[PDB]
Amino acid sequence: LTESARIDGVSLYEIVIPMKIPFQISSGTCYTRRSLVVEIREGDLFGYGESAPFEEPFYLGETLETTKVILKNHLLPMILGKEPLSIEEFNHLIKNGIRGNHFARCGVENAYWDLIAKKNKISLKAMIEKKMKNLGVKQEYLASNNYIESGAALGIPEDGRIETLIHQVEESLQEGYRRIKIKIKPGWDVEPLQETRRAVGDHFPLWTDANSSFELDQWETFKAMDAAKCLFHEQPLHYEALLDLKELGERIETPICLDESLISSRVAEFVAKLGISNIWNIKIQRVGGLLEAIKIYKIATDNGIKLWGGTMPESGLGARFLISLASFRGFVFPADVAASEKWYGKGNDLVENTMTDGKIYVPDEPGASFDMTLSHLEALGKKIWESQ
């Protein structure tokens, strides 16, 4: 398996996909998925990757606009004409001239995996396993399933009615989702979790996602939520309040899960060393690409830390990168991955990811974009920048 390719051409598409289900985002409405697609060309081969920042700067400070700037003016010109010897060398290359900006780096890094996967006629999953192996990931954690399990994510209902949330819990069960997580924030916490737990039974995989909206001195609220016996509480405090997150964990029975805190493998290293949390969420976009995600996977599995996969979400294309990764043994709870048909309508996503009885199967074909036709890409978006 060769990991080298020459970057003969690069292009940037802005894709726009109408949401069949406008959902409550973190800054209001959201009728449409608006994303960037990086196209890397070697000869006649093309790799594609997605950067999916928000339009508002509430997540790491990056926006669609700043991501365009970084990509057009710095990152895409830097890689043009380059001939990296490996995935690791390409990772070094893209980080060199650009710190932060993980969404921009992710779209470029993922496109390179796609290009290499296709050039080698091999599945993403296969490349990931090999990389894992080369990095010295423990044999037990090179094992995998051929699917990921899929969980529902439920917001806080705009009418503040528990029954509106509960109607959605019922729909999620009927739809086949294998796990539910519900949004919480101070004042919308113990009650919704209580009514949810009983709508699904103690047995059903359930967790909260507070989106950092609590502080440690509100710990008693978590104490009260211990009765719902959920699997963990996802990111309850500020992403930089690492010791507070460890301390909360010591005051309650329900474990604490990190999402926003885990911004890189370097951070993962010392978070593992300090025993801040035993349950980590992995979002490829958050960490700036797949290799970084894999390095984090090694650190977690080296330390008995349980993983599960999440997404921003991106389009089906970005999700492909997570889908291959998230089937490995390290991943032990259902992932947040959007089933194409539900959110965009059948066939309307950039690529189709299908949920059957709460499972999404891992593609065996090469790379991420095997089933993306150029004309479908051109139908969903426009080339906004290019250079040869």
Binding residues for Mg(2+): 209, 234, 259
Host H or E run for residue 225: helix 219-225
Cβ at position 216, least distance to its own copies in Å: 11
Nearest residue relative to Mg ion (C-beta): 259
Q: Determine the Cα–Cα distance for residues 245 and 269; give it in Å rounded to an integer.
A: 16
28, 99, 136, 158: residue in contact with its own copies (rule CB under 8 A): 99
Q: Which residue has the tokens 């997540």?
A: 59
Nearest distance, CB of residue 24 and its own copies, angstroms:
17
Q: Choose, by CB under 5 A, the member of 42, 50, 259, 292 that binds Mg ion.
A: 259
- 155/49 Cα distance (integer angstroms): 28
* Burial label, 44 (beta-carbon count in 10 A; 0-12, 13-18, 19+): exposed
Pick 79 or 165: Cβ nearer Mg ion: 165
Q: Do the Cβ atoms of 271 and 258 come closer than 8 Å?
A: yes
128, 130, 135, 138: CA torsion to nearest 10:
90
Shortest Å distance, C-beta 210 to its own copies: 16
Q: Which is nearer to Mg ion, 12 or 230 (CB)?
A: 230
CA 141 vs. chain centroid, Å, equals 20
Query: Interface with Mg ion includes 129 (CB under 5 A)?
Result: no
The half-sphere exposure of 154 on its side-chain side, counting CA atoms within 13 A, is 26
The correct pick among 61, 81, 160, 186 for binding its own copies (CB under 8 A) is 61
Helix (H) or strand (E) holding 50: strand 45-51
Q: Show the site string, 212-251: x = touches its own copies by CB under 8 A, - = not.
A: --------------------------x-xxxxx-------
Binding residues for Mg ion, rule CB under 5 A, total: 1
Binding mask 12-51 for its own copies (x = CB under 8 A): ----------------------------------------
Report 274-293 residues binding its own copies (CB under 8 A). Answer: 274
Q: Which residues are catalytic?
A: 183, 283
- Angle at which helices 290-302 and 87-96 pack, to 10 degrees? 110
Q: Which of 9, 24, 34, 59 binds its own copies (CB under 8 A)?
A: 59
* Out of 74, 223, 359, 376, the residue judged to bind its own copies by CB under 8 A: 74
39 binds Mg ion (CB under 5 A): no
CB burial readout 168-182, b (16+ within 10 A) else e: bbeebbeeebbbbbb
- Which is nearer to Mg ion, 40 or 106 (by Cβ)? 106
Q: Counting contacts by CB under 8 A, is residue 58 touching its own copies? A: yes
Nearer Cβ to Mg ion, position 3 or 259?
259
Cross-strand pairs, 247: none
What residue 114 binds from its own copies, Mg ion, none (CB within 5 to 8 A, per partner kind)? none
Looking at residue 259, its amino acid is: D
Smallest separation (angstroms) from Mg ion to the CB of 66: 22
Q: Which one, 147 or 239, has the nearer CB to its own copies?
A: 239
Instruction: Give me the DSSP letters along 92-136.
Output: HHHHHS--S-HHHHHHHHHHHHHHHHHHTT-BHHHHHHHHHHHTT
Q: Are 213 and 235 in contact (CB under 8 A)?
A: no
DSSP state of 379: H
Q: How near is the Cβ of 73 to its own copies at its closest, in Å?
A: 7
* Token pair listed for 113: 């995996």
The neighbouring-strand residues paired with 152 are 180
Pick from 1, 65, 146, 356: which binds its own copies (CB under 8 A)?
A: 65
One-letter amino acid of 100: G
Size of the site for its own copies (CB under 8 A): 32
Distance CA 53, CA 55 (A): 7
Q: CB of 113: closest distance to its own copies in angstroms?
A: 22
Smallest separation, CB 74 to its own copies (Å): 6
> Is residue 57 part of the contact set for its own copies (CB under 8 A)?
yes
C-beta separation of 198 from 173 below 8 A: no
DSSP letter at 233 equals E
Tokens encoding 208: 């909260």
Residues of this chain that interact with Mg ion (CB under 5 A) are 259
The residues of the shown chain that bind its own copies, judged by CB under 8 A, are 56-63, 65-66, 69-70, 73-74, 97-101, 238, 240-244, 264, 266-267, 269-270, 273-274
